[PDB]
């Protein structure tokens, strides 16, 4: 933290500001602690998070967890992008708890990411945890490095989508996931 | 009848001016040149003159009335005259 | 009830409250009677509820009963989750009354439940009552043990979905159920 | 916590459950830690929370912070009620930070409350912190002790509203607050 | 720019990243040029921007320019906040062009700001340019330092509002501005 | 004409002040320095002075008028002067 | 028309196009006839348009004609702006026909205009036609010289508003006009 | 530019205007610079724009970039048409950056276009840049040469749609693109 | 009816049709009976319709009957206009039945009308029936002689509004009527 | 026109009106000219309307023109019906202009029609003009001879739908047309 | 200058009180303890005292002013004083 606190201090001097006024006194020490909140996913691990919450039950039907809110930091411009994550899976005699599906996302979105890589890592982390019959992941997001700066398309919203297992092989299993999330 | 009440709406530089109700003096409304009407939905009659309210106050002084007070209530300005 | 009335009395003393003030005098006896309303489904039975209301008629076409409101109690955190239940079936020369389809749900949702188990039990209870050609059940729900406490995703909403009979075998029979409920 | 963990153990035995099955093993220890999250507001204090974030500036115009989400526990039935909080104030040469207005609410909503008392305590806590010219508080909420149990009005939603200072004395100052929150 | 390019290079090393991989090679030089876009308002001046576009005409009736999009950088946490700006004025025999009203906002929002200060500076910049009979400014905004980090109220949205001239003195002039913007 | 009516809008520390209607005294409006106009949509003429209303009340006392009463109606403040 | 047909021919050669290809053969003669449609309001007159359609009737209550679509050409950049016109009046023993209120707008919007001037000219044209007790005009519009080029605020929408007669003098007459148009 | 500045000067004299009044003095020099903004796409090239931003990654799943705003000039009547562009592609071990997909559109829409030709040129420009497995392009647009002049259908909105690669060969790949954009 | 049946027979011959084909055989006799349905209000009377349904009760508070559908025939072009009627009244110890308020409208809208005259006649018919303290009438309508033919504004919708009694004298009584109908 | 002007004169005398009052003086001559506007489609021809606007281009992908507004006259009751027309086609190396697709509709809707016949005639007129690979036509409409008179279903809205060519043979070509129009 | 106009806003038990405009008496505002300001957007100057308006009326009587009339217009209460 004191290396980051000095690292935003050279930014404030470089933009023509004055770090001595009342607004910018604690700004090196408050912004640097917010950059360790946005990249705190690196110290977390799948085994420590799931907490032995994988439940044994004969329910082999579809489970969809929609409207999960993510908040990530882009790694080209270091400017946030926010959005919603839609996850669905077919459990194979082992159901995962509904909070741990949303706590997996907190591990991989709280990093420096790229949305194509962010989509794939959630679906592989759910596959290695449960061994289910199929996983689907849809991530919608608005990139502030396209809205604020550069091209300035304030309405654009990129969607990415990963299907694994029998969401990829069976087309009647992917047409049900895309309907209930609506 | 010593008391008398006149009023006017949205602007004071233009009429019409209310000058009385059902039980007012018929000779006094005839000197002021008043006409009588009932607007639709109302249960009462009223007299009106089409003059601006400054001209009516100059008529009513020659008959013997003096302005006690003036009020503004709503979008209406009311004068109260006593003889 | 007096064992539950003493059982919330030790909770109020344990949180640092004062049970002697005017707000918390009847709180042991009003909250304990509300915990027997939320788990009153155990004393109910399918045969006593259907009340000989199964009607004989040659109508072999689809019947969907949508927007049924459920209100259940989770059994990991003892904190409610609420939602909507969508039920559809294909009657095989025996039509069930539209109130008893919504009164079956009151039996199984008014228990300590898990949403994957709650979805399956309604569809099996309709199968054993009518012997129809197919049953479908879709349950949407918001878990207050994900919104209030823990991860705090206020917008998340888990959907589960059970298909039995010819809703599972025929794909053109499941694509009609998912369209009319919209 | 071990006194609460034994206190939900006598509830599970009293409803006719079996605490020995896999769903109800950690249920005394997970639900009791969620009852200390819902009533953790008692150990918090206004002075420790504001954190010297009261800023001096000549801006004497209206500041409204809308859609703050609260999540409280009722104290008659011990059953949650959730809603939104709308707060507006007129600063008198001292502006409060926008996070501390939403962190004041977390102190008073995370208690056993009654909505009429909950409305008044936020507005008095903002008055004693800033000394502003006027405070307004509007709280919307849905009571699960009216939706789930009892009368079962699933759509009802009680609104309460406290105005202090020149929101109470001046009618043209209250008609602006009620318009921008829409 | 090379001082900022070295200044984000010490941030990437401090978070546990590797600046040598393909994603983080041009990240010091692309993010530093995006921090000079977000604070480029300091080199702009009101006289250079208005460009002699103040038009003489006998129209003394209300002019409202709504839905102007701003995109600012907070100065406590250095994390963006975005929103909409609503500006209305009563011209006193001099009408300003509709683009320069939206180009004034670009001067003051593209700085390190605080929303109470940001509201007041637009309304004073319009007063000194035209000398009109009255100015009104309403700014809605969502603070990512309240949504992403800290309190995590994803729905909260602070509104501030400055009225000058006869928008402050006359109450029938402020009730028309607040109606047409809806 | 003994009666006279002046008014002013949003603030009393600034003009313009209304001083009369169509049938007012032409010499008295000339001493006050009044100008005449008709706003669009109105069916009547009106006189106005650009002075604040305290200065007009100090002019009208030297001519012989005394303030009977004052009212506030709407966003307008009306003085009624009698000679 | 042949002077305009040569006048767009020098534009097409100046942008680097080729006027010889199949798309740009009739483009001088089709675009020039569309520039005489957009400015055909100059040859129209109020007396020729009203066509003796002013009807005598004792109805002295409010008449509002909302959602009239206008389509005008700006006169600074020669780039269109489109919008909606809301007109209301109080007839004084003479009612105007509802088509001629919308055919007055076609006279003044089909010119090179500025929106502040466009608002005032409709309200004065209705005053001189009927002599009513009061006229109100509200014009909403989106300027393509603010959306496409320049500042690029795609959502901005300027509103102007003219009140004459007793819409200006009476505040309870303007608060009814602004409510029914909603 | 001085040839265009003289070229709009002969238009203003031809419509019966007066170029000497205050509104139409800088109108030849401001409108001619706006006609070089609307046709500035001719000097841009695909290789200069992509800027070596093609990233190598094993993500072979669908990427959709929706709500891209275009603003084009028709080439029959020289009157604008505006709309939205929806682009989706299947990357074949090479992902393109999300800004360059929206900056390709700026090259081809900022020309004199026809919407059928405009749809095809974006999809061929993405094919030659990435060599992906499939490209899809949907363009919605409203033609002001159908709304303002001619037929005057103010609500009409033409949609065109180009599919290349395995969006054309596979029908289960086109039914997913058409669902996520909604 | 046989005079009308011959009267549409001369219309069909005058437009260039053939009255001998299968579509236009019963068209003189079906359209003429539909012109006596659209003008059947002339044979109805207020006393025959109210049917002694005026009820005596001490309820002196406001009664609003909204969304009454009317369907009238214009009398300049003989082309329909349709809309909604909003009626509110203050009963003076005599309440009228809610069906007879909507059956009064059927008397006056099923005539050849003009919307300014149509508004006034309903409010006078309610005044003479009940003698209430005040009547309000708001009529929205779309004129097909403005949408189909003539100016072709498909979105325009004229509103007229009559207030009698204490809806005209009291401004706090008219601001409540205009709020509850929304 | 004088035969129609006498033909509405016998209608006004037959309904019990008085043709001598001020409203019904020009009613024979204004309504008869509006009946020649509603049936002016008979004098128009496809060849005179298309105006050599069929453009040669290699674009063989789908073109949909949605929300075209029609306004027709029924031929059983002579009472209007209004609605929207959705047209889509697959061009076979010849693209038709977007205005002429909406000007074809004006030919066939401005007649005495029946909606089943009206749907088929547009699709055959587009087939004979372009020779495309397939045509689709969807027409929504509300019949005033079902809303005003007769059954009085104010919400009913008949949809008809014609598919020709490969919209009829290929089912994956009709499922795309029905999706983009939404 | 015989006439004088004071006003106060939202409550009458607290200040500040307006006491004059641009052309007021400089010695009289100095005895009342007035300060001068211009609020942003206004085109005029104004004097104010921070005292409640009952205390200002007790000062102005010792100088020789008598309250003619009082009005309430808007959310403002206006007193009119004559010497
Ligand atoms: N599938 C499913 N999972 C449920 C239901 N109700 C419920 O609480 N869960 C899960 O039960 C799990 C219990 O978690 P746990 O034993 O690790 O302990 P915990 O409460 O401290 O975890 P937490 O931090 O996520 O709240 C949670 O992860 C939650 O997702 C339900 O109805 N269905
Ligand atoms: N399928 C179908 N069932 C109907 C219709 N109308 C109607 O009341 N029913 C059913 O008729 C059944 C009659 O129930 P019942 O003989 O057990 O007696 P009940 O009224 O006391 O039951 P309740 O408590 O559900 O109202 C109800 O369960 C209701 O669902 C209908 O149109 N279709
Ligand atoms: N009025 C106002 N306050 C702001 C703005 N931006 C911004 O961060 N703040 C406030 O700045 C304050 C700084 O808080 P602080 O010094 O106590 O430290 P902190 O960041 O750790 O607090 P946190 O836990 O709430 O994030 C926050 O409470 C936040 O509300 C703004 O534009 N206007
Ligand atoms: N009030 C008003 N202003 C208008 C209208 N149309 C129109 O272009 N303007 C203004 O005309 C002004 C002309 O600006 P300018 O002379 O400085 O030159 P410019 O076009 O290069 O400026 P730009 O960069 O903002 O486009 C613009 O600022 C724009 O706001 C209109 O109808 N009403
Ligand atoms: N106030 C009012 N005007 C009406 C009604 N119905 C109706 O057609 N009108 C008006 O009647 C007028 C008759 O116009 P007109 O005598 O000049 O002849 P016109 O039909 O050829 O005019 P057009 O070109 O506008 O259709 C139209 O301007 C139209 O606005 C109605 O209910 N109320
Ligand atoms: N696929 C993908 N691309 C991303 C993400 N974040 C992000 O900035 N990009 C892309 O990263 C690219 C970096 O562009 P660049 O090296 O040419 O430099 P640049 O920032 O100056 O380009 P610009 O003008 O478009 O902002 C941008 O084109 C942007 O589309 C992301 O999460 N996914
Ligand atoms: N104010 C009021 N009127 C009511 C209520 N319920 C109810 O039926 N009415 C009225 O009761 C009246 C009874 O009408 P009536 O004696 O003339 O006979 P009716 O049913 O044949 O008339 P109808 O043709 O309108 O149905 C109706 O006009 C209806 O408006 C109610 O709750 N409030
Ligand atoms: N497919 C297509 N057609 C277009 C575009 N832009 C554009 O104006 N058109 C068509 O260009 C055609 C040119 O028509 P035209 O040569 O017959 O002459 P015109 O303008 O007088 O016809 P009009 O009366 O329909 O406006 C119009 O029918 C219009 O549909 C476009 O982007 N795509
Ligand atoms: N109701 C009136 C005000 C008023 C009240 C009482 C008496 C006279 C007038 C307004 O308008
Ligand atoms: N209508 C005025 C108030 C007023 C009413 C009557 C006379 C004078 C003024 C406001 O504004
Ligand atoms: N604000 C008060 C009116 C008032 C203004 C000033 C002084 C006293 C009262 C109302 O309520
Ligand atoms: N506009 C003031 C009322 C007022 C009008 C005129 C003069 C003084 C005060 C309110 O607030
Ligand atoms: Zn980025
Ligand atoms: Zn739980
Ligand atoms: Zn309760
Ligand atoms: Zn911040
Ligand atoms: Zn312009
Ligand atoms: Zn065109
Ligand atoms: Zn008509
Ligand atoms: Zn019909």
Numbering used by the authors:
A (entry chain J), C (entry chain I), D (entry chain C), E (entry chain B), G (entry chain A), H (entry chain F), ...: 68 to 249
B (entry chain O), F (entry chain K), K (entry chain L): 1 to 83
List passages from the publication reporting this PDB structure.
Guanosine triphosphate (GTP) cyclohydrolase I (GCH1) (EC:3.5.4.16) catalyzes the conversion of GTP to dihydroneopterin triphosphate (H2NTP). This reaction is the first and rate-limiting step involved in the de novo synthesis of tetrahydrobiopterin (BH4).
The inhibitory and stimulatory protein complexes were reconstructed applying D5 symmetry, yielding maps with resolution of 2.9 and 3.0 Å, respectively, which allowed building of atomic models. The quality and resolution of the EM maps allowed for unambiguous identification of bound ligands. F122 seems to act as a clasp, holding the loop in position by π-stacking against His143, localized at the opposite side of the active site cleft. Region B consisting of residues 213 to 222 is only weakly defined in the electron densities in all structures without an active site ligand bound (xtal_GCH1, EM_GCH1+hGFRP+allosteric, and xtal_GCH1+allosteric). It is well defined in the other structures (xtal_GCH1+active and EM_GCH1+hGFRP+Phe+active). One structure comprises the substrate-bound, allosterically stimulated form of the GCH1−GFRP complex, and the other comprises the allosterically inhibited, substrate-free form.
